[PDB]
Amino acid sequence: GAGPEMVRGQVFDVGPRYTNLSYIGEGAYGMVCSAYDNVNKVRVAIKKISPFEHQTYCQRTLREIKILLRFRHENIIGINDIIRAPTIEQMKDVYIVQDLMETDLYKLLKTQHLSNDHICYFLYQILRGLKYIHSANVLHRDLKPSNLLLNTTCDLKICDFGLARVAVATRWYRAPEIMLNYTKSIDIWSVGCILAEMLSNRPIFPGKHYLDQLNHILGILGSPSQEDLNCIINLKARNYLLSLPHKNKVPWNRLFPNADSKALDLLDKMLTFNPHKRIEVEQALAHPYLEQYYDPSDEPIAEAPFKFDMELDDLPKEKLKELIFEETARFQPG
Ligand SMILES: O=c1[nH][nH]c2cc(Nc3ncc(Nc4ccccc4)c(Nc4cc(C5CC5)n[nH]4)n3)ccc12
């Protein structure tokens, strides 16, 4: 035997099936590598997750595993295999094996300029995948360029469903009502921020903190109306927004001077302050900007709305560890 595999001084115990590890990146309680699968004879992606110190991390890990194993769609990453220890006492990590994509939209927008036809095609695929997520009555809640995977041929897949919930995130893509007070409309806001980013290669609302975010949004949309603030919002935010002087609305064609007129019309409908007046996923897909790709006969929806049989928020982390251990059992030999 070669012993357990390692990446940057950390254990990455995926051998003997998965070898030739190459580091991709890491988060607060996870590390992602590429690996060679000696069974399917292809490179795969492997996310190491260590969530057992916290109840919220345990919830997140179980939600993503349950959602991605149920979900079946071309524009949503799947789970091909799961590695963990043979006993619950030894399980300190969970390894989720997924299809390897060439890059994410964060890295592509950092090095490449997108033509209008590539923006239109990437937007179409995001909303196609989102149409399936929302048809299952699930919210992604963390749509951003780093959670959108791309391959050589331009095929797109949505990943990272840890924050997903049935119907918190990166602040630049957060809907104003998350900061103010959530609903399916928060994902449409995020897609709106991604479209704006694809047009100019720069984040549309790059706030350094929660107040700077709201100031950035108001800087473009202008001061909110009485109806825009008439919702169940926190007193601090309301009083802060009412204390601000008037801000004029910046026309979309002034922010993106050479962007396609149809793309700015859709951008306007997605980046609407009031979530009730914001365009829904089906109407977005049927918008004139996405006409050359819209195909209702080839846009699948979930057979039924997704639901958790248990109250995951209420369960102690020891109970969630047992549910994670049992959920990953079908990937063990037997
Ligand atoms: O879990 C994730 N949430 N958001 C993420 C962004 C990543 N970014 C990423 N960049 C590049 C590649 N491709 C690559 C290929 C060869 C050499 C170096 C990198 C990549 N691929 C990838 C990730 C996944 C699954 C999400 C883990 N499949 N394919 N991901 C990787 C993982 C995640």
Swiss-Prot record:
Motif interval(s): Cytoplasmic retention motif: 295-299
Residues binding ATP, per UniProt: I24, G25, E26, G27, A28, Y29, G30, M31, V32, K47
Cofactors, names only: Mg(2+)
GO CC entries: azurophil granule lumen; caveola; centrosome; ciliary basal body; cilium; cytoplasm; cytoskeleton; cytosol
UniProt modified residues of type Phosphothreonine: T170
GO BP term, example: long-term synaptic potentiation
Alphabetic keyword roster: Acetylation, Apoptosis, ATP-binding, Cell cycle, Cell junction, Cytoplasm, Cytoskeleton, Disease variant, DNA-binding, Host-virus interaction, Kinase, Membrane, Nucleotide-binding, Nucleus, Phosphoprotein, Repressor, Serine/threonine-protein kinase, Transcription, Transcription regulation, Transferase, Ubl conjugation
Pfam families registered for this protein in UniProt: Pkinase
Catalytic residues in the record: D142 (proton acceptor)
Motif Nuclear translocation motif: positions: 304-310
Occurrences of domain Protein kinase (ranges): 18-290
E.C. no: 2.7.11.24
UniProt KW Oxidoreductase keyword: no
Catalytic reaction(s) noted: L-seryl-[protein] + ATP = O-phospho-L-seryl-[protein] + ADP + H(+); L-threonyl-[protein] + ATP = O-phospho-L-threonyl-[protein] + ADP + H(+)
Transcription regulation in keyword set: yes
Summary of subunit composition and partner proteins: Binds both upstream activators and downstream substrates in multimolecular complexes. This interaction inhibits its tyrosine-kinase activity. Interacts with ADAM15, ARHGEF2, ARRB2, DAPK1 (via death domain), HSF4, IER3, IPO7, NISCH, SGK1, and isoform 1 of NEK2. Interacts (via phosphorylated form) with TPR (via C-terminal region and phosphorylated form); the interaction requires dimerization of MAPK1/ERK2 and increases following EGF stimulation. Interacts with MAP2K1. Interacts with DUSP6. (Microbial infection) Interacts with HIV-1 Nef through its SH3 domain.
Record's disease association: Noonan syndrome 13: A form of Noonan syndrome, a disease characterized by short stature, facial dysmorphic features such as hypertelorism, a downward eyeslant and low-set posteriorly rotated ears, and a high incidence of congenital heart defects and hypertrophic cardiomyopathy. Other features can include a short neck with webbing or redundancy of skin, deafness, motor delay, variable intellectual deficits, multiple skeletal defects, cryptorchidism, and bleeding diathesis.
Role description: Serine/threonine kinase which acts as an essential component of the MAP kinase signal transduction pathway. MAPK1/ERK2 and MAPK3/ERK1 are the 2 MAPKs which play an important role in the MAPK/ERK cascade. They participate also in a signaling cascade initiated by activated KIT and KITLG/SCF. Depending on the cellular context, the MAPK/ERK cascade mediates diverse biological functions such as cell growth, adhesion, survival and differentiation through the regulation of transcription, translation, cytoskeletal rearrangements.
Domain comment, as recorded: The TXY motif contains the threonine and tyrosine residues whose phosphorylation activates the MAP kinases.
Protein name from the UniProt record: Mitogen-activated protein kinase 1
Organism: Homo sapiens (Human)
Name of encoding gene: MAPK1
